[PDB]
Symmetry: C3
Subunit: 622 residues, 3 copies
């Protein structure tokens, strides 16, 4: 049941372009959803009849006159419109919520029994589509995406919850790989965004929106390159104690490093290290929050026949101005007796939007990091895995294996000293220092958090001398530095990052970057080394290559003839980077024939392959 009733309010357009004094007065409106939905705040009550009752399909309002006659109608005859039809969804007493089309103004009206009152407001709605694909209607088809939308004194509206919206998915580009080449034959019914970046050091990121039919070649710098195409998923294409051991493993996810542990008298050791995962975790000093502010304008304090010298009332984005000789004796809006001895004090400030919480950003300094690594090492018959911070000190407390990953070979970061985080998205942005705010620009208003912890704003509010027909406090103001930065935020770092880094946000991090080499010291338990205790003596090895392909995954095929005393298990490895073997161990029999697969990227290569203790040389054309 209700404790308050529908009121009447001054409107500027009422079925006749002339300003009136009707119910259904529009006070505010919210256009913040990713969804194409709207929240309207009117002066009329819905859901109630004559009293504050429970009529699912009834509203009530003030009278055409002013007799305090709160007559009622059926929620059936209340319709919204902007520049076309509008279909409501929910009624919340004083509030409406609908999906409307263009967005030049908003008109709420009653079309009951011939009597037609309608207030309309001069607010501008814009076409909203969330995806990287332009749509005018959520597809029956397509993907589910993170978005926010409206549900279906203070807190009484339809709150802004995050949820899922259906974006369409674009018509997979017919791709054509070539010599360091990718033409991308594209054919979209609609406007799709096409992003790219190299996975090398210099990514030369490249965004564009495409429509209809074109082709789009891109170089492939040998390091490959990622391309997102219209809220598809981001495919990327390429160009086709114990013994302490010190190596240097290149920092590149998923690519195993084969090496040979050489110890006197002992038999060479199976060693493959795979940097399963890298993270670059930098230290984050959150500076402030920021969002769409709201401007509050309290009824002006007017003093009939005196001076009103306004006083600095320290808070939010406060501003006053003292205006003299305001209203003349008779009406002009008020009941003041003197003419040129009047004064009004215009005061107004800013707060956070009712929805600041659901859509804000995070000013954040970022100083140099640390980097963990998911190392997976295999030695002989056992494979183990430890995480390790990359500095000359902290050992990866793997129980059976003590590893320390030396200082990375080149300090590199995707981030700048200063960073903004919007949603899951981080941008390198030189946001102003807390308290050094410029208006209409990003960070126009600031706050250490959402709980309005000392919010300091600068929104260039400008109070205007009010004319004398009504008590209305006028003012201009700057634009919303947030919204303005939003419509002009770049393509995220997750899409521009200089090394194929996969920027992640809660911990700010650069997942799976690829650059430089990592020194690594491994303490292998003596308990897994075999000392010349392979009964087979091995002698007279030679190398023959059966087949070969140039620059493939594993197109190499070579065989090794020899003579061994008995049976055992040899570790095979190449002592020249011009080639690498697919396997690191081989079951040597007495037959004297060992087939091994390898990979290269040359026409006529020369590499020294090594069985157990012996070494040879191989050759072939690819």
């Amino acid at each position: 049941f209700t404790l308050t009733s529908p009121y009447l309010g001054t409107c500027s357009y009422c079925h006749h372009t002339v300003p009136c004094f009707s119910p259904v007065k529009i006070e505010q409106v919210w256009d913040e959803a990713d969804d194409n939905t709207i929240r309207i705040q009117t002066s009329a009550q819905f859901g109630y009849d004559q009293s504050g009752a429970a009529s699912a399909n009834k509203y009530r309002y003030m009278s055409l006159k002013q007799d305090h006659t709160v007559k009622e109608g059926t929620m059936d005859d209340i319709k919204i419109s902007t520049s076309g039809p509008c279909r409501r969804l929910s009624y919340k007493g004083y509030f409406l919520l609908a999906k409307c089309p263009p967005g030049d103004s908003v008109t709420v009206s009653i079309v009951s029994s011939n009597s037609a009152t309608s207030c309309t407001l001069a607010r501008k709605i814009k076409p909203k589509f969330v995806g990287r694909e332009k749509y005018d209607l959520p597809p029956v088809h397509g993907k589910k995406i993170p978005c926010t939308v409206y549900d279906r004194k203070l807190h009484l509206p339809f709150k802004l919850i995050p949820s899922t919206c259906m974006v369409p998915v674009a018509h997979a580009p017919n791709v054509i790989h070539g010599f360091k080449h990718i033409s991308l034959q594209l054919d979209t019914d609609h406007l799709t965004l096409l992003t790219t970046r190299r996975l090398g050091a210099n990514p030369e990121p490249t965004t564009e929106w495409i429509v209809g039919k074109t082709v789009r070649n891109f170089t492939v710098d040998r390091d490959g390159l990622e391309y997102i195409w219209g809220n598809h998923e981001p495919v990327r294409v390429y160009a086709q104690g114990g013994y302490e051991h010190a190596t240097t493993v290149p920092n590149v996810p998923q690519i195993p490093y084969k090496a040979l542990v050489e110890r006197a008298g002992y038999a060479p050791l199976n060693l493959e290290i795979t940097v399963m995962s890298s993270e670059v975790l930098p230290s984050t000093n959150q500076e402030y929050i920021t969002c769409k502010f709201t401007t509050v304008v309290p009824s002006p304090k007017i003093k009939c026949c005196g001076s009103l010298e306004c006083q600095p009332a320290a808070h939010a984005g406060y501003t006053c101005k003292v205006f003299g000789g305001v209203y003349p004796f008779m009406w002009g809006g008020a009941q003041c007796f003197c003419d040129s001895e009047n004064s009004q004090m215009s005061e107004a400030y800013v707060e956070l939007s009712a929805d600041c919480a659901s859509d804000h950003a995070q000013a954040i300094k970022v100083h140099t990091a640390a980097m963990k690594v998911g190392l997976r090492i295999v030695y002989g018959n056992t494979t183990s895995f430890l995480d390790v911070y990359v500095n000359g000190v902290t050992p990866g407390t793997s129980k059976d294996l003590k590893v320390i990953a030396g200082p990375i070979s080149a300090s590199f970061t995707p981030f700048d000293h200063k960073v903004v985080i919007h949603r899951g998205l981080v941008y390198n942005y030189d946001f102003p220092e807390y308290g050094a705010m410029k208006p209409g620009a990003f960070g126009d208003i600031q706050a250490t958090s959402l709980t309005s912890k000392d919010l300091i704003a600068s929104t260039d509010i400008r109070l205007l001398k009010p004319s004398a027909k009504n008590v209305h406090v006028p003012y201009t103001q700057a634009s919303s530095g947030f919204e303005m930065w939003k419509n002009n935020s770049g393509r995220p770092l997750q899409e521009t990052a200089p090394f194929g880094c996969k920027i992640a946000v809660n911990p700010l991090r650069a997942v799976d970057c690829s650059y430089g080499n990592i020194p690594i010291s491994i303490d292998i338990p003596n308990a897994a080394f075999i000392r010349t205790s392979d009964a087979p003596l091995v002698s007279t090895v030679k190398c023959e290559v059966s087949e070969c392909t140039y620059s493939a995954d594993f197109g190499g095929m070579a065989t090794l003839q020899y003579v061994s005393d008995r049976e055992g298990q040899c570790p095979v490895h190449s002592h020249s980077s011009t080639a690498t073997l697919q396997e690191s161990t081989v079951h040597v029999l007495e037959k004297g024939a060992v087939t091994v697969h390898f990979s290269t990227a040359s026409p006529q290569a020369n590499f020294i392959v090594s069985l157990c203790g012996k070494k040879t040389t191989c050759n072939a054309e690819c």
Copy 2:
């Protein structure tokens, strides 16, 4: 009467943005007319009451519930809308047909007694205007033009060709000058202005104009054609602003007569004027295929509860399948199956021709070198005859009394390329792909030797998608309609770009009235029309005087010939130098000794040898 009833169908937007399961479900829509009209295919029946009867103003539909209650209403309360009003025209049982405005989506709804159901579809309509003049409404005024439009298996409103009213633009105030044409233009709306030179190199030039501008164009001496907004195509030039076998060479240029003198020993010179009345350049046409807007058919997916479904190449149209595993769960979630990760759906779909492929298609066509006929009109003495003749050193124009053979043209030239497309009446030089070598979304995406679907082979980059498990719905992307795409990007027709002022024509593919090079011609004139020195008046002592003259006019020349003749007769007057030509070829010689003749030139101080009967002289003047 009807044998089938209104059904219910899943929609994606129903008065509340939420997808529903309502009647009035929109299944397809057609946006192909040149007219601004639309064909809609709904789930509800119109024209019938409770049963399949004859209610001119009644429809029926399924219920709000599902009781198979087929309740009825009045065709009065069914309204269409897209982004504004829409006015229907006809009801065809399941079908609607209206004219609608913008074209972002389509919404069919019932606004009866407070209960409001409405399905709406995410289709995009575009502003259609047929003419070369932009209009938003057919004028009360203006021209009638060829267009296609909807009438008012096969049950819809068919697509017939007919006539549409385009507006005609405000005649440009033209100003001729020295090799010059400024075109002062002033249009209320968007009009297309085309041009091309009539010479060898036409440098064609299209532009759409609005409001007020000027547009000069050179005039290369060969003149030039300009169409201006579905006006008719005026063009402007640069003047001020057996028997005896005779061998000449007539320039190939329509309507311009060739005066010559037959000189035979002892015989009296002969009246000879040849007018190439008409030329045609008829090249051999190998139609390759048809092409048009395809339609994609998606048959209900065959799902096998708890097994593998390895799909098989079912050879036809543009067929494609894909086998999707671990599709749906148990009971409700996905089609009444019982296993979870032991499921499989086969997504299959193909393409056909549009219901309207026939009314709007194109014709892939190779064009190898031609033959050219000519409408020759020859006059000799008192008789004028006319024969058609192929232009090769052989085939004689079987005119009964006159045997003509037109030698091989002086320069093989064609307006066409080895490969050509013909859309409506319009031909474009376009390198369409070979039959069976189709690229998708590009022209010729789908092919067919004819409209009777004679082995249609398509490539439309269809891509099947793994269906999610809340409904049995087979998803897929696809390429764009290579036809429509080529349509929105067909150039300006050849009829408007042709390099010699050719008037490209289509049913026989032909280049009417081109103008280039000279035509050798051998004429066998019947001896029976030659006069041998049998003009009694002896003619002697001719001289030439020019009274007036204008330079480069139609016939501004005026000269007189004094002489002395024995008696009366009829002389043939002709000029033995191309620097000038006479308007008349015969003259009634009297004894007076004074003959006035009109001539035309294009020089200041010309020198030409005029010839009466047998005598010859020289004339002079400044123009």
Copy 3:
């Protein structure tokens, strides 16, 4: 009152079905001329009356669906207008409607009574109209009042076009930043605002642009300053920080000229002249009027079975054409008897628009002027003020002071030989001579005045052969040279004028220009001169400067020590333009200390200051 005429039926081209019909509510004309976004519609149906011509505030009447002359009636309740959206009427005037409509592609008037729906629609194009220099889609509740014209709401029977006041919005005051010969203009507008500028010097290099959202806009400041209008704000400008006597005063409003009258034996005289106001009044020969013409098309005179050789009927913009073989028999063409022996004469002409009077322009030659001046001269204890024409002759008949202002130093005018005046606005425009009209260009139609004093038009009307299904006379025509010039009139002279002139219009004039110097001869009444009759000798003056600021209003501060015999009153003045004194007289005491304020625009200046008879030199750094 009551009516004497009834609703008729007319051929329409679109009637609820795209097919042309023969319905009531036939739209005959429409008016789209207001600055307001309002429309005047002329239909075939009568409003305000029932069955007879009575007084039904809410009733209309019309012809029948059939043709029985049955003039049935409805309620003015069910008649609605639309163009491409809703339309709300305002007034009913018998045959006329008047509404505010949105886009403007066509116009549709219809009746939606009891299921029977007739609607005629017309192919006219309405355009978005906003009057201000600020783009708006709705008059603000806020903002300024501006001159505009609009249709009333209370031959001659329509809703007339009266000039009045329209509310334009006022833009968000630019945050301005002054610098070294510099003005950056930080701008932030919700909407499209016009930003004009011009230098106040000789060469103004005027610069218009429309801005939106947020930018910055620097402008040089040429030492002469410069005016900037910003979006129907007011146009701020910023700068760079008896005895006959013959002087030459610089022509510059409000800046006083201090001088010393030196006469033998007499004591120097207080002389300050302020050119309070200047006017440049040139001679105006109005040539013609011009405006939106209207084309009249009288029913064609057709002669059944004969030739109709049309005759030059001398008037307005007359044109005829004789068309032969028009209509076959009856319903072969227009009811007649012969087929190819028919002839129609198509005639049509132009008039002035019903509203030509409220919105026209004025072709006007302008030959060289005269210039008056508001001179305010002060001599000793008395200050007087005379106006004076600036030529070597006419004396300013001030009673006690005879002044003659010599011929100005440089003949300069803001205007060209030929000028157009639209509203209050004058543009330099080479309009064609009377009778030398080109069509669609400005001055397409002409008239010595509004009373249609011999109006001569050239509107390229082109008659077309009418097709034979109806008697309808077709024709093309050129565009409205007026309207065309309107949409393409430049920025007014009031905004481009080369010397900071304030162009004014009724008398055509150039208010308060600033250029060159004015010679002036003054006849000062001997009766105000003091001859060495001040009791003090003055001797030994020196100059000391206390403080100084460079290029300020009056930042200079100097003191003068000396020795005087007695008390008196000295005239202080600077004998070098490098500096000027704020005061011209000083009360000399015996103390020997005189403090004076001065102004300069230099770092280390050198000027010769002069007391009574003595002279010195001053110095300081600023």
